[PDB]
Every structure is written in C-alpha cells, then in structure tokens.
Amino acid sequence: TRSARIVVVSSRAAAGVYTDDCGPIIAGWLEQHGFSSVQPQVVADGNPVGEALHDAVNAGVDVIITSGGTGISPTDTTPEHTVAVLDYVIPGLADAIRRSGLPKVPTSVLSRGVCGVAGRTLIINLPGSPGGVRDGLGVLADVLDHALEQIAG
C-alpha cells in the first residue's frame, strides 16, 4: 500500500463538459489507505483508456483504480482495454465487486468490469456511479493489503 493512479473514463467529462463525481470518491478512499494524494485522470472511452493504463503500468504503480465504461453501451470498452493490458484476471474480485452493489442496484450484473495484475500493478475496474464505486472500494478494502503483499512476493 503506497502508489496509485485513478483513471475515470468519460468522454464528456474528459472534454471538460461534465462532472467527475467518482474520481474524488476514489481519491479520498486512497488517502484513507496509505496512498496520497492521487488526482483523477479523466479520459475518453477507447484508445485513451489503453494509453492511460499502459502508461500507469510502465510507471510501476502498485494500484490502478478505474471508474466507468464497463457497461454494455456501444461506447463502453473499458474491460477490453483493461484485459489487453493485463497479464491475467482476478475473477473472484470482479464478481464480488458486482455483487457488492447488488442488493439493491439489480443492474449491477451488467457491469463488465475486470480486475487483474499487469507486471506488479493491480488494476481494478469499478462502475461509473458514485454508489457502485463506494460499494466496490468497500470490497477492495477487505483484500487490498493481502493482494499487495502477495503480488510483491
């Protein structure tokens, strides 16, 4: 637990014509867990996602947290770009993040987020909504320290 990036995926927000409410949530939670102070990078759907992830992995960050672009809309390609960068996926973590918001938000099941490892960087896809983000960070909090420990040895 020490270094991280945040990538918020929204073409409108990235163009500066829309609010990013998810990024600040992630930044605050990271501050509570031994990182600090990370500022959101807001990028458009598509190639800019690949570009941000490769850049962050090649920086050797411990953790990348993404928000948005995981649904089933024409333009949601975050999972594809993430899988491309990943060495492998962590299915149980992605499933638990989906189930976290479920009670509750039944459409949770439509988020196609993955999590995985690339090099020694842990990557987490979260949904593009403030509640889905907070619920998924709650899931991550139960396992982050262990996950980072394991990746390091």
Residue among 14 and 83 whose Cβ is closer to a second copy: 14
How is residue 67 annotated by DSSP? E
Binding a second copy (rule: CB under 8 A), the pick from 132, 137, 139, 147 is 132
* Minimum gap (Å) between residue 48 Cβ and Cl ion: 15
DSSP 8-state symbol, 4: E
- Rounded to an integer, what distance in angstroms lies between the CA atom of residue 43 and that of residue 38? 15
Q: Which residues bind Cl ion (CB under 5 A)?
A: 68, 70-71, 127-128
Could you give the angle at the alpha carbon of 144 between the alpha carbons of 103 and 26, nearest 5°? 65
Number of residues binding to a second copy, judged by CB under 8 A = 50
Q: Which does 147 bind (CB under 5 to 8 A by kind): Cl ion, a second copy, none?
A: none
AA letter at 83: V
Interface with a second copy, residue 12, by CB under 8 A: yes
**100, amino acid identity:** S
Tell me if 21 contacts a second copy by CB under 8 A. Answer: yes
